[PDB]
Amino acid sequence: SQGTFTSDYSKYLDSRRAQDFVQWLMNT
Length: 28
Ligand SMILES: [Cl-]
Ligand SMILES: [Cl-]
Prior knowledge:
Glucagon; hormone; glucagon; GPCR ligand
């Protein structure tokens, strides 16, 4: 199974993606 390191890295990647969406929402 995915260990804590891989799972935490995926939550980091999720954060990058969600933050890019937050930025996109302000874009025009
Ligand atoms: Cl791992
Ligand atoms: Cl991304």
